Each structure stands twice: as structure tokens, then as C-alpha cells.
């Protein structure tokens, strides 16, 4: 069964996610408006990414053990994982009905063309959509989804990590919780090789991160596009 510590860990991460992910998307009204006519969707989508980084941070601070890391390592982990957790957490709004992210209204429904109108190409978008479909298809429990985000953040192999032993230790506690959760609470047939498939998604996220990094470097290098970004996005993803 799940130990009391494992049950504790899950409860904390569920609550953390609930406190940082508003399924009504009410705060979207505060963003620069979407424009679908250049890079017309960049102001709206940069604000959405900026907002999302803040939420990912609020979630990360609540991960059991994350507080025991130094601020240096906290920074390295958040900076390397931010885009990956945003792509992960975005699965909640993603829908296979029409391959889009549906955040409540037609204004806040983003399709492949919207993403391309933020300065990114199919080199990123096609694998991103394929990621989202394969992730959807796993039909994760919310418990598994929040554990996966947390494991994504506390990855010891991120470049610049100083205390990799401690990061690996925190991650192992989460990974063991997820494996045990799948065994005890996820019924077959759904549970078939589920953990291995979740870890494969973390691998897919690394390739998405690399490609995002490449396209962002190129996008932000043009000072007219970097003007469209936010101070937080620049700090987290880079300022040329």
C-alpha cells in the first residue's frame, strides 16, 4: 500500500496544484489580448507563459523536500524545467477533439496556427502536439499528473545542479511514490507499463526543451520580438 508519508506527499502535491492551476482560467483576462489576423499572438502567449512560470514556481515551492535545497539549486531546477512543466500542465486544457488548448472561451482557445503566430515553427509544434496526444492518451489520474510535474522539476541531471545527490534523493522519494501509486490505485488495463510511459514523456520533454530553447534563442535575438516578452520570461529563458 501507500505509506502515510506517500499519502502525505500526494495530498500536498494535489493541494499545491489546486492552489496554482485555476481550471476556470479567470486570470487570462489580465493578459494582453490575443490577436489572430508579424507574430500577432506573441504578446498574449508571452503573458500566458509568464503567468505560467509564476504558477509553476508556486507549485515547486510546495514539493516535499524542495525547501531543503539551496536557493542556487532551486533556481537551476526551475530555470531548466519551466518550459517542460508548462507543456505538462497545459495537458489539462489540451483537447484531442480538435488538437487545441481550450481555456474556456474561443478567445482563449489555441491551435497550431496560434502557436506559429508566437514565433515558433512546426519543428517544435508537431512534436509538441504529438506529445500532448500521447500524454492525453495515458488518461492520467490527477495524482499521477502532479507527481509527474514534481519529478520533472526535481531532476538531478539538469546542467548546473550542485547537490545532485540531494536532488536525486528528493526525486527518488517522488518516483517511488508514483510507482507505488500506480500499483495500488491505478487499475489494469490502464496501468500497463504506465510508469515507463510516463518516464518516456520526461524524455520527450527534454527534446521539446532543446528545440524550444533553439527557437526562443532565435526569436529573442530580434530586439523587436524581445520587446514583446515579459521581464520574467527574459530572466528565465534568456536575454540574448
Amino acid at each position: 500500500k501507500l505509506s502515510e508519508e506517500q499519502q502525505h506527499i500526494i495530498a500536498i502535491l494535489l493541494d499545491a496544484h489546486h492552489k496554482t492551476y485555476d481550471p476556470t482560467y479567470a486570470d487570462f483576462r489580465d493578459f494582453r489580448p490575443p490577436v489572430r489576423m508579424p507574430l500577432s499572438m506573441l504578446p498574449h502567449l508571452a503573458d500566458l507563459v509568464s503567468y505560467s512560470i509564476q504558477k509553476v514556481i508556486g507549485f515547486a515551492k510546495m514539493i516535499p523536500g524542495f525547501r531543503d535545497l539551496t536557493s542556487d539549486d532551486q533556481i537551476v531546477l526551475l530555470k531548466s524545467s519551466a518550459i517542460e512543466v508548462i507543456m505538462l500542465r497545459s495537458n489539462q486544457s489540451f483537447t484531442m477533439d480538435d488538437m487545441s488548448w481550450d481555456c474556456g472561451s474561443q478567445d482563449y482557445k489555441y491551435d497550431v496556427t496560434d502557436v506559429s503566430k508566437a514565433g515558433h515553427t512546426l519543428e517544435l509544434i508537431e512534436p509538441l502536439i504529438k506529445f500532448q496526444v500521447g500524454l492525453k492518451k495515458l488518461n492520467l489520474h490527477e495524482e499521477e499528473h502532479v507527481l509527474l510535474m514534481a519529478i520533472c522539476i526535481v531532476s538531478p541531471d539538469r546542467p548546473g545542479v550542485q547537490d545532485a545527490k540531494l536532488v536525486e534523493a528528493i526525486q527518488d522519494r517522488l518516483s517511488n511514490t508514483l510507482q507505488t501509486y500506480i500499483r495500488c490505485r491505478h487499475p489494469p488495463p490502464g496501468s500497463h507499463q504506465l510508469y515507463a510511459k510516463m518516464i518516456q514523456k520526461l524524455a520527450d520533454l527534454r527534446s521539446l526543451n532543446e528545440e524550444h530553447s533553439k527557437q526562443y534563442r532565435s526569436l529573442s535575438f530580434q530586439p523587436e520580438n524581445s520587446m514583446k516578452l515579459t521581464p520574467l520570461v527574459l530572466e528565465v529563458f534568456g536575454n540574448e
Binding site: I57, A60, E235
Partner: peptide, 11 residues
Amino acid sequence: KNHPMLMNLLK
């Protein structure tokens, strides 16, 4: 590298 915003949000 200096990450005052990230640092601030991390508390």
C-alpha cells in the same frame, strides 16, 4: 547569473 525575480518568487 542574477535572477532577482525568480529568487523573489522562490522566497
